[PDB]
Amino acid sequence: MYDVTEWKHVFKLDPNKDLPDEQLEILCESGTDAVIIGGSDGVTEDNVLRMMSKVRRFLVPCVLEVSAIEAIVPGFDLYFIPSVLNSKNADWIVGMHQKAMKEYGELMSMEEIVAEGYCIANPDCKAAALTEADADLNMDDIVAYARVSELLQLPIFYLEYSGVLGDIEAVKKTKAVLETSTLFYGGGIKDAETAKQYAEHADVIVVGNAVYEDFDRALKTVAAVKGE
Amino acid sequence: MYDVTEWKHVFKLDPNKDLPDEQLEILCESGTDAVIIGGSDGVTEDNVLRMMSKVRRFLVPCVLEVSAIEAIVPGFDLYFIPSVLNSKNADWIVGMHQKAMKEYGELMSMEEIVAEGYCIANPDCKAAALTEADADLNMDDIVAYARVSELLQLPIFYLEYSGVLGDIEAVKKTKAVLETSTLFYGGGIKDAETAKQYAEHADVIVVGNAVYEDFDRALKTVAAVK
Ligand SMILES: O=P(O)(O)OC[C@@H](O)CO
Ligand SMILES: [Cl-]
Ligand SMILES: [Cl-]
Ligand SMILES: [Cl-]
Ligand SMILES: [Cl-]
Ligand SMILES: [Cl-]
Ligand SMILES: [Mg+2]
Ligand SMILES: [Mg+2]
Ligand SMILES: [Mg+2]
Ligand SMILES: [Mg+2]
Ligand SMILES: [Mg+2]
Ligand SMILES: [Mg+2]
Ligand SMILES: [Mg+2]
Ligand SMILES: [Mg+2]
Numbered sequence: 001m002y003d004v005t006e007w008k009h010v011f012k013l014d015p016n017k018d019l020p021d022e023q024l025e026i027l028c029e030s031g032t033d034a035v036i037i038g039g040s041d042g043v044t045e046d047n048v049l050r051m052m053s054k055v056r057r058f059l060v061p062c063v064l065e066v067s068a069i070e071a072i073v074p075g076f077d078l079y080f081i082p083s084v085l086n087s088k089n090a091d092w093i094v095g096m097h098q099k100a101m102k103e104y105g106e107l108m109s110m111e112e113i114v115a116e117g118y119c120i121a122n123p124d125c126k127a128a129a130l131t132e133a134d135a136d137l138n139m140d141d142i143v144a145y146a147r148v149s150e151l152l153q154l155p156i157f158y159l160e161y162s163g164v165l166g167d168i169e170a171v172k173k174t175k176a177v178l179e180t181s182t183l184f185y186g187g188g189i190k191d192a193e194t195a196k197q198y199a200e201h202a203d204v205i206v207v208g209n210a211v212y213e214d215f216d217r218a219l220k221t222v223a224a225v226k227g228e
Numbered sequence: 229m230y231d232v233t234e235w236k237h238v239f240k241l242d243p244n245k246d247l248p249d250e251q252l253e254i255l256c257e258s259g260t261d262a263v264i265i266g267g268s269d270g271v272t273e274d275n276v277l278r279m280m281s282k283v284r285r286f287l288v289p290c291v292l293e294v295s296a297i298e299a300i301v302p303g304f305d306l307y308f309i310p311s312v313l314n315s316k317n318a319d320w321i322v323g324m325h326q327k328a329m330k331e332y333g334e335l336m337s338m339e340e341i342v343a344e345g346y347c348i349a350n351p352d353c354k355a356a357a358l359t360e361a362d363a364d365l366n367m368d369d370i371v372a373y374a375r376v377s378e379l380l381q382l383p384i385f386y387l388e389y390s391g392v393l394g395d396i397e398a399v400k401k402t403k404a405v406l407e408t409s410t411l412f413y414g415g416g417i418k419d420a421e422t423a424k425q426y427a428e429h430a431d432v433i434v435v436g437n438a439v440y441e442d443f444d445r446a447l448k449t450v451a452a453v454k
């Protein structure tokens with residue numbers, strides 16, 4: 001019953017970190033279009049499970065982004081499965097997914113899965129280090145990866161700059177080539193001003209770190225793009 | 229674009245080989261559903277261009293399976309860009325697609341391109357060596373790759389055994405999990421009986437170099453399947 005082509009804003013939460021329960025409830029009731037749990041490496045199934053149990057009561061779609069096979073947990077509305085298009089390690093493109101289909105084939109069949117084509121464009125983040133991403137890219141390299149995603153018809157193309165604001169022109173040019181894919185942008189959005197700037201180009205903006213740095217300011221990112 | 233979900237038989241030609249007399253014409257007029265220009269151990273743009281010029285004049289769909297950016301040549305009805313799912317080198321999974329998009333984005337926009345999920349299941353062949361494929365696979369590994377191919381939205385999953393016949397049970401099992409893409413099988417098919425056998429499970433059977441070794445025998449594979 002979900003359709004990411006109707007979304008405009010999502011919060012992405014790190015189960016590796018702690019957020020007060022009250023704040024988690026407020027984010028779920030914020031008007032965001034989805035709450036995504038970042039199920040990565042360093043990530044534990046126990047933390048993903050606790051998060052699932054806390055957010056499942058809400059109406060908002062809860063999504064698990066599967067970055068580590070060991071941390072998959074049933075019960076989420078949607079499962080996003082990333083392929084890091086610019087990784088130099090086949091494991092982050094295909095490898096880990098093949099291991100998951102081999103070990104949890106029945107589980108993967110029962111879930112609603114959405115493939116994401118990731119382009120990590122911030123060379124200094126944990127994610128680029130983990131995935132062996134060729135993250136120091138020129139704009140034309142970025143646009144070519146978006147075309148690759150648009151060709152494989154992955155539903156989502158995710159331009160990832162994690163803790164830094166990315167070149168806004170890269171976001172604009174990427175959106176220019178994407179016809180059927182939904183463009184998710186994440187990177188340094190920490191307040192309403194920056195949220196609105198990037199939402200002018202991205203289809204969906206992702207707000208993550210800011211939630212833990214300045215909650216009230218990060219909360220305003222939803223009204224910034226979805227409000228009057 | 230021509231609909232691969234309606235195909236049953238294709239011939240795949242090596243542009244670095246030449247069929248004699250009027251055999252290429254007979255093959256293109258045979259009833260096969262497509263003629264794919266492939267290649268081995270690299271290919272050359274000039275050889276692909278000469279092949280294009282010969283097959284484009286027939287109604288049968290002509291397809292270029294891109295195995296090198298340097299050999300993309302305009303003029304084909306469809307372009308298949310393989311992603312070698314089981315390659316240990318990212319360049320064979322998404323590298324070809326990225327370079328082609330960066331270097332020839334406008335050409336890619338004007339042509340009809342199809343991503344093809346390849347699984348090289350013969351560890352002892354040029355293709356496995358060239359693509360650094362982890363090709364010594366168990367049937368569950370093959371099935372899992374097929375599941376991935378669909379995860380990645382690929383319209384075609386190609387199970388490749390190159391110069392030998394692959395395990396008929398692997399074909400049967402992969403067909404069983406492919407809910408939304410088309411299963412192409414290629415590897416060692418040279419005659420009607422074998423073509424019919426594999427066509428029982430594959431959506432499309434690919435007949436390759438048998439056309440150079442024994443054309444009359446290979447030509448019978450079309451009627452065998454269709
Ligand atoms: O933490 P930030 O910088 O907001 O980025 C959100 C998301 O892109 C992280 O995967
Ligand atoms: Cl764990
Ligand atoms: Cl057709
Ligand atoms: Cl020829
Ligand atoms: Cl004709
Ligand atoms: Cl053969
Ligand atoms: Mg929309
Ligand atoms: Mg546990
Ligand atoms: Mg719920
Ligand atoms: Mg939009
Ligand atoms: Mg059919
Ligand atoms: Mg070959
Ligand atoms: Mg023609
Ligand atoms: Mg024509």
Ligand SMILES: [Mg+2]
Binds near residue numbers: 284303304
């Ligand atoms: Mg023409």
Ligand SMILES: [Mg+2]
Binds near residue numbers: 430431432
């Ligand atoms: Mg069929």
